[PDB]
mmCIF file of C-alpha atoms and ligand atoms in Angstrom:
data_model
loop_
_atom_site.group_PDB
_atom_site.id
_atom_site.type_symbol
_atom_site.label_atom_id
_atom_site.label_comp_id
_atom_site.label_asym_id
_atom_site.label_seq_id
_atom_site.Cartn_x
_atom_site.Cartn_y
_atom_site.Cartn_z
ATOM 1 C CA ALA A 1 -15.188 16.785 4.784
ATOM 2 C CA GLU A 2 -16.030 17.411 8.022
ATOM 3 C CA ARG A 3 -13.185 16.191 10.963
ATOM 4 C CA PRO A 4 -15.025 13.005 11.879
ATOM 5 C CA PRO A 5 -16.018 13.330 15.861
ATOM 6 C CA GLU A 6 -14.678 11.386 18.721
ATOM 7 C CA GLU A 7 -17.689 9.071 18.405
ATOM 8 C CA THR A 8 -17.131 7.769 15.158
ATOM 9 C CA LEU A 9 -13.354 7.511 15.947
ATOM 10 C CA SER A 10 -13.539 5.275 18.770
ATOM 11 C CA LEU A 11 -15.561 3.047 16.730
ATOM 12 C CA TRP A 12 -13.160 3.553 14.253
ATOM 13 C CA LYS A 13 -10.386 2.363 16.688
ATOM 14 C CA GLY A 14 -12.741 -0.392 18.102
ATOM 15 C CA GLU A 15 -13.364 -2.234 14.460
ATOM 16 C CA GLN A 16 -9.119 -1.881 13.388
ATOM 17 C CA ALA A 17 -8.597 -3.401 17.373
ATOM 18 C CA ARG A 18 -11.666 -6.374 16.276
ATOM 19 C CA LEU A 19 -10.011 -6.629 13.021
ATOM 20 C CA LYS A 20 -6.594 -6.753 13.451
ATOM 21 C CA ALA A 21 -6.860 -10.576 15.256
ATOM 22 C CA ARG A 22 -7.350 -11.990 11.769
ATOM 23 C CA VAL A 23 -3.712 -10.409 10.319
ATOM 24 C CA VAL A 24 -1.195 -13.231 9.373
ATOM 25 C CA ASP A 25 2.127 -12.166 9.609
ATOM 26 C CA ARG A 26 4.266 -15.020 8.202
ATOM 27 C CA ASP A 27 4.474 -16.084 4.467
ATOM 28 C CA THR A 28 1.689 -19.158 3.109
ATOM 29 C CA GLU A 29 2.067 -19.003 -0.603
ATOM 30 C CA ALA A 30 4.396 -21.380 -1.950
ATOM 31 C CA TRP A 31 6.294 -18.366 -4.253
ATOM 32 C CA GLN A 32 7.376 -16.231 -1.008
ATOM 33 C CA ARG A 33 9.644 -19.325 0.303
ATOM 34 C CA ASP A 34 11.202 -19.169 -3.143
ATOM 35 C CA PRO A 35 14.586 -17.599 -3.846
ATOM 36 C CA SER A 36 13.554 -16.069 -6.642
ATOM 37 C CA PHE A 37 9.585 -15.939 -6.216
ATOM 38 C CA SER A 38 9.341 -18.254 -8.686
ATOM 39 C CA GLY A 39 5.531 -19.193 -9.189
ATOM 40 C CA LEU A 40 4.686 -15.747 -8.617
ATOM 41 C CA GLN A 41 3.169 -14.042 -11.570
ATOM 42 C CA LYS A 42 0.502 -11.053 -10.837
ATOM 43 C CA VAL A 43 1.056 -8.261 -8.604
ATOM 44 C CA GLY A 44 -1.241 -6.340 -7.757
ATOM 45 C CA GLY A 45 -1.526 -1.981 -7.110
ATOM 46 C CA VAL A 46 -4.026 0.663 -5.931
ATOM 47 C CA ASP A 47 -3.713 4.053 -5.509
ATOM 48 C CA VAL A 48 -7.030 6.810 -4.943
ATOM 49 C CA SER A 49 -5.967 9.930 -6.159
ATOM 50 C CA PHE A 50 -7.981 12.830 -4.621
ATOM 51 C CA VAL A 51 -9.334 15.938 -6.918
ATOM 52 C CA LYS A 52 -7.625 19.354 -6.315
ATOM 53 C CA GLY A 53 -11.083 21.503 -5.636
ATOM 54 C CA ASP A 54 -13.509 18.499 -4.450
ATOM 55 C CA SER A 55 -13.594 17.222 -1.125
ATOM 56 C CA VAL A 56 -15.809 14.737 -2.236
ATOM 57 C CA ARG A 57 -14.479 13.491 -5.462
ATOM 58 C CA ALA A 58 -11.528 10.882 -6.251
ATOM 59 C CA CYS A 59 -10.748 8.454 -8.370
ATOM 60 C CA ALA A 60 -9.811 4.921 -6.896
ATOM 61 C CA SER A 61 -7.548 2.635 -9.443
ATOM 62 C CA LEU A 62 -6.313 -1.617 -9.437
ATOM 63 C CA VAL A 63 -3.889 -2.569 -11.740
ATOM 64 C CA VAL A 64 -2.478 -6.114 -11.949
ATOM 65 C CA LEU A 65 1.234 -6.686 -13.594
ATOM 66 C CA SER A 66 2.854 -9.490 -15.164
ATOM 67 C CA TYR A 67 5.550 -10.596 -12.459
ATOM 68 C CA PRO A 68 8.624 -10.452 -13.174
ATOM 69 C CA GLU A 69 8.382 -8.018 -16.565
ATOM 70 C CA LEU A 70 6.284 -5.327 -14.697
ATOM 71 C CA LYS A 71 3.537 -5.248 -17.649
ATOM 72 C CA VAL A 72 0.045 -3.979 -17.125
ATOM 73 C CA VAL A 73 -2.649 -6.687 -17.512
ATOM 74 C CA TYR A 74 -5.150 -5.557 -15.674
ATOM 75 C CA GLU A 75 -6.745 -2.299 -14.853
ATOM 76 C CA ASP A 76 -9.750 -0.678 -13.459
ATOM 77 C CA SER A 77 -10.211 3.548 -12.460
ATOM 78 C CA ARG A 78 -13.620 4.570 -10.538
ATOM 79 C CA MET A 79 -14.465 7.691 -9.654
ATOM 80 C CA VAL A 80 -16.192 7.589 -5.866
ATOM 81 C CA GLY A 81 -17.830 10.140 -3.246
ATOM 82 C CA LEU A 82 -15.915 10.215 -0.415
ATOM 83 C CA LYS A 83 -17.512 9.737 2.875
ATOM 84 C CA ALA A 84 -14.611 10.726 5.520
ATOM 85 C CA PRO A 85 -11.641 13.411 5.647
ATOM 86 C CA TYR A 86 -7.908 12.215 5.509
ATOM 87 C CA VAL A 87 -7.796 11.285 8.993
ATOM 88 C CA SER A 88 -4.110 10.361 9.894
ATOM 89 C CA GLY A 89 -4.303 6.380 11.441
ATOM 90 C CA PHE A 90 -7.600 6.247 9.719
ATOM 91 C CA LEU A 91 -7.019 5.806 6.144
ATOM 92 C CA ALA A 92 -8.673 2.849 5.684
ATOM 93 C CA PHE A 93 -11.968 4.520 6.872
ATOM 94 C CA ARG A 94 -11.983 7.468 4.070
ATOM 95 C CA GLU A 95 -11.026 4.413 0.895
ATOM 96 C CA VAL A 96 -10.408 0.926 1.737
ATOM 97 C CA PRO A 97 -14.312 0.188 0.588
ATOM 98 C CA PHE A 98 -13.896 1.342 -2.665
ATOM 99 C CA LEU A 99 -10.529 -0.831 -2.959
ATOM 100 C CA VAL A 100 -12.388 -3.949 -1.922
ATOM 101 C CA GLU A 101 -15.004 -2.763 -4.727
ATOM 102 C CA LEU A 102 -12.608 -3.025 -6.726
ATOM 103 C CA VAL A 103 -11.162 -6.152 -6.039
ATOM 104 C CA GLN A 104 -14.553 -7.210 -6.823
ATOM 105 C CA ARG A 105 -15.083 -6.072 -10.352
ATOM 106 C CA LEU A 106 -12.049 -7.951 -10.443
ATOM 107 C CA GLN A 107 -12.981 -11.100 -9.512
ATOM 108 C CA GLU A 108 -16.578 -10.684 -11.833
ATOM 109 C CA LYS A 109 -14.831 -9.622 -14.585
ATOM 110 C CA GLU A 110 -10.930 -11.393 -15.029
ATOM 111 C CA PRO A 111 -11.030 -13.966 -11.849
ATOM 112 C CA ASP A 112 -7.806 -15.469 -13.762
ATOM 113 C CA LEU A 113 -6.087 -11.794 -13.061
ATOM 114 C CA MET A 114 -6.385 -11.980 -9.717
ATOM 115 C CA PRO A 115 -3.251 -10.826 -8.329
ATOM 116 C CA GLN A 116 -1.079 -13.129 -5.685
ATOM 117 C CA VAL A 117 -0.229 -9.856 -3.950
ATOM 118 C CA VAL A 118 -0.899 -6.254 -3.617
ATOM 119 C CA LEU A 119 1.469 -3.508 -3.139
ATOM 120 C CA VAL A 120 -0.919 -0.651 -1.349
ATOM 121 C CA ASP A 121 0.297 2.798 -0.414
ATOM 122 C CA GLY A 122 0.386 3.599 3.498
ATOM 123 C CA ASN A 123 1.042 1.297 6.386
ATOM 124 C CA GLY A 124 0.360 -2.335 7.413
ATOM 125 C CA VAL A 125 1.672 -2.741 10.449
ATOM 126 C CA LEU A 126 3.309 0.374 10.855
ATOM 127 C CA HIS A 127 0.440 2.032 12.424
ATOM 128 C CA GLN A 128 -0.657 3.500 15.367
ATOM 129 C CA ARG A 129 -2.724 0.319 16.504
ATOM 130 C CA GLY A 130 -0.896 -2.201 14.070
ATOM 131 C CA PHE A 131 -3.528 -2.067 11.714
ATOM 132 C CA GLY A 132 -2.988 0.224 8.743
ATOM 133 C CA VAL A 133 -4.897 0.541 5.617
ATOM 134 C CA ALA A 134 -2.318 -2.666 4.127
ATOM 135 C CA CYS A 135 -3.657 -4.681 7.128
ATOM 136 C CA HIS A 136 -6.940 -3.603 6.405
ATOM 137 C CA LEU A 137 -7.105 -4.451 2.820
ATOM 138 C CA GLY A 138 -5.784 -7.407 3.404
ATOM 139 C CA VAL A 139 -7.387 -8.729 6.069
ATOM 140 C CA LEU A 140 -11.031 -7.458 3.868
ATOM 141 C CA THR A 141 -10.225 -9.450 0.845
ATOM 142 C CA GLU A 142 -7.688 -11.960 2.753
ATOM 143 C CA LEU A 143 -5.149 -11.166 -0.682
ATOM 144 C CA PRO A 144 -1.568 -10.581 0.533
ATOM 145 C CA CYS A 145 -0.630 -7.523 1.153
ATOM 146 C CA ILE A 146 2.240 -4.976 1.725
ATOM 147 C CA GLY A 147 2.520 -1.447 2.793
ATOM 148 C CA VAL A 148 4.737 0.603 0.748
ATOM 149 C CA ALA A 149 4.176 4.115 2.589
ATOM 150 C CA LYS A 150 6.499 7.508 0.868
ATOM 151 C CA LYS A 151 6.637 9.096 4.107
ATOM 152 C CA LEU A 152 7.476 7.927 7.966
ATOM 153 C CA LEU A 153 4.448 7.552 9.950
ATOM 154 C CA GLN A 154 5.842 8.919 13.318
ATOM 155 C CA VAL A 155 4.809 6.578 15.958
ATOM 156 C CA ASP A 156 6.589 4.089 18.780
ATOM 157 C CA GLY A 157 8.540 6.343 19.130
ATOM 158 C CA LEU A 158 9.595 6.485 15.590
ATOM 159 C CA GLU A 159 10.982 10.077 14.308
ATOM 160 C CA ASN A 160 12.309 11.423 11.518
ATOM 161 C CA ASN A 161 15.093 13.106 13.368
ATOM 162 C CA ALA A 162 18.765 13.909 12.567
ATOM 163 C CA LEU A 163 19.735 10.102 13.570
ATOM 164 C CA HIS A 164 17.120 9.305 10.904
ATOM 165 C CA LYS A 165 18.467 11.002 8.313
ATOM 166 C CA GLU A 166 21.801 9.829 9.116
ATOM 167 C CA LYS A 167 20.406 6.278 8.413
ATOM 168 C CA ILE A 168 19.529 7.163 5.449
ATOM 169 C CA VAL A 169 22.296 8.771 3.596
ATOM 170 C CA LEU A 170 24.120 5.478 5.008
ATOM 171 C CA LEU A 171 21.883 4.019 2.015
ATOM 172 C CA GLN A 172 23.724 4.218 -0.535
ATOM 173 C CA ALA A 173 22.137 1.573 -3.675
ATOM 174 C CA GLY A 174 19.472 0.436 -4.513
ATOM 175 C CA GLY A 175 17.898 -2.822 -2.066
ATOM 176 C CA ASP A 176 20.080 -0.861 1.021
ATOM 177 C CA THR A 177 17.919 -0.922 3.720
ATOM 178 C CA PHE A 178 17.657 -0.333 7.100
ATOM 179 C CA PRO A 179 14.808 -1.474 10.316
ATOM 180 C CA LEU A 180 12.810 0.179 11.682
ATOM 181 C CA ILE A 181 12.349 -0.274 15.206
ATOM 182 C CA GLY A 182 10.047 0.643 17.741
ATOM 183 C CA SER A 183 10.772 1.768 21.373
ATOM 184 C CA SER A 184 9.465 -1.697 22.685
ATOM 185 C CA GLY A 185 12.124 -2.829 20.555
ATOM 186 C CA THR A 186 9.601 -4.657 17.837
ATOM 187 C CA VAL A 187 10.910 -4.443 14.407
ATOM 188 C CA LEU A 188 7.612 -2.267 12.540
ATOM 189 C CA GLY A 189 9.138 -2.492 8.951
ATOM 190 C CA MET A 190 11.789 -1.579 6.949
ATOM 191 C CA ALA A 191 13.497 1.914 4.821
ATOM 192 C CA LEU A 192 14.219 0.774 1.937
ATOM 193 C CA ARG A 193 16.150 2.790 -0.773
ATOM 194 C CA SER A 194 14.088 1.739 -3.843
ATOM 195 C CA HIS A 195 16.670 2.249 -6.867
ATOM 196 C CA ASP A 196 20.135 3.687 -7.273
ATOM 197 C CA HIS A 197 19.019 7.116 -8.757
ATOM 198 C CA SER A 198 16.870 7.780 -5.920
ATOM 199 C CA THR A 199 17.761 9.360 -2.501
ATOM 200 C CA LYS A 200 14.479 9.146 -0.244
ATOM 201 C CA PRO A 201 13.488 6.014 1.170
ATOM 202 C CA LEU A 202 10.216 3.487 0.957
ATOM 203 C CA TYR A 203 8.679 2.792 3.914
ATOM 204 C CA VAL A 204 7.694 -1.003 3.833
ATOM 205 C CA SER A 205 5.744 -3.233 6.188
ATOM 206 C CA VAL A 206 3.831 -5.863 6.534
ATOM 207 C CA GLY A 207 -0.259 -6.012 5.183
ATOM 208 C CA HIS A 208 -1.064 -9.518 5.557
ATOM 209 C CA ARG A 209 -0.105 -13.305 4.846
ATOM 210 C CA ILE A 210 3.659 -11.853 4.140
ATOM 211 C CA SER A 211 6.884 -11.573 5.805
ATOM 212 C CA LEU A 212 8.514 -8.471 6.422
ATOM 213 C CA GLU A 213 11.930 -9.756 4.437
ATOM 214 C CA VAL A 214 9.965 -10.742 1.889
ATOM 215 C CA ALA A 215 7.874 -7.469 1.570
ATOM 216 C CA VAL A 216 11.020 -5.880 1.140
ATOM 217 C CA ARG A 217 12.260 -7.824 -1.672
ATOM 218 C CA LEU A 218 9.847 -7.985 -3.772
ATOM 219 C CA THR A 219 8.880 -4.143 -3.272
ATOM 220 C CA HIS A 220 12.289 -3.592 -3.833
ATOM 221 C CA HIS A 221 11.968 -6.175 -7.055
ATOM 222 C CA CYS A 222 9.296 -4.108 -8.676
ATOM 223 C CA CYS A 223 10.730 -0.949 -8.999
ATOM 224 C CA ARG A 224 11.585 1.154 -11.932
ATOM 225 C CA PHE A 225 11.842 4.074 -10.240
ATOM 226 C CA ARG A 226 11.257 5.281 -6.013
ATOM 227 C CA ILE A 227 7.400 3.962 -6.508
ATOM 228 C CA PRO A 228 6.679 0.165 -7.180
ATOM 229 C CA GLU A 229 5.788 -0.129 -10.805
ATOM 230 C CA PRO A 230 2.080 -2.024 -9.548
ATOM 231 C CA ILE A 231 1.720 1.735 -7.292
ATOM 232 C CA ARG A 232 3.282 3.924 -9.526
ATOM 233 C CA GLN A 233 0.986 2.692 -12.460
ATOM 234 C CA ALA A 234 -2.288 2.593 -10.989
ATOM 235 C CA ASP A 235 -1.068 6.266 -9.556
ATOM 236 C CA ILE A 236 -0.474 7.755 -13.068
ATOM 237 C CA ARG A 237 -4.053 6.057 -14.411
ATOM 238 C CA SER A 238 -5.818 7.962 -11.220
ATOM 239 C CA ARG A 239 -4.679 11.140 -12.466
ATOM 240 C CA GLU A 240 -5.244 10.786 -15.875
ATOM 241 C CA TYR A 241 -8.542 9.840 -15.257
ATOM 242 C CA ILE A 242 -9.464 12.611 -13.191
ATOM 243 C CA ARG A 243 -7.839 14.537 -16.053
ATOM 244 C CA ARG A 244 -10.229 13.304 -18.476
ATOM 245 C CA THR A 245 -12.872 14.019 -16.128
ATOM 246 C CA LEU A 246 -11.905 18.209 -15.682
ATOM 247 C CA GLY A 247 -12.077 17.987 -19.743
ATOM 248 C CA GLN A 248 -8.134 17.614 -20.609
HETATM 249 K K1 LIG B 1 -3.263 6.232 -2.049
HETATM 250 MG MG1 LIG B 2 -0.826 6.522 -4.712
#
């Protein structure tokens, strides 16, 4: 509903700094150091869709897909009540509690389908304070997480200016990338052209327990369309559930 007061945003910033010390930005799973990701069998995807008329009602979805076939083997959607509006840089405080609850519900119902990695709609370390929603989910669940964003977060001097759009033009095939370098010189993420018949890139960053190069290549391998299939299937389910709720 209402934008949070400065007292709340300060506490949220403090919480992000405390948790950021737990981010692991290298590979820690045997399949991640395999040239073909042999051993990777389950890739997760999450989405939260907010109802057009209601600032309280939302639908959170978790899917698990087989790898490499990308078939849905687990799905869960839930209507939830929002506690916070969208504020850029504080996305996790609007939705990460629902995602954690979705992972806990999977652990109770189908523990053998726990994903080995989760694609999250939104940034990881490409973030105002280096701790976006993909890092936040990763630290709370200890699952490997990848941040996949559909627009460029303009932090650390990153801009969607004419030079950025030129670089996008040079991305000519599915799988082409260019690095996102902050003013500090740090590599924050990668722009990725995710398939041959899309021109607007994805922006991929490390969430937790994965390296950037592995994060980018896996994201590419999950793309049948622009949006990686685990996120895409969670989107589809969240919106269908909202539709059926309003009657349709
Ligand atoms: K989402
Ligand atoms: Mg989505």
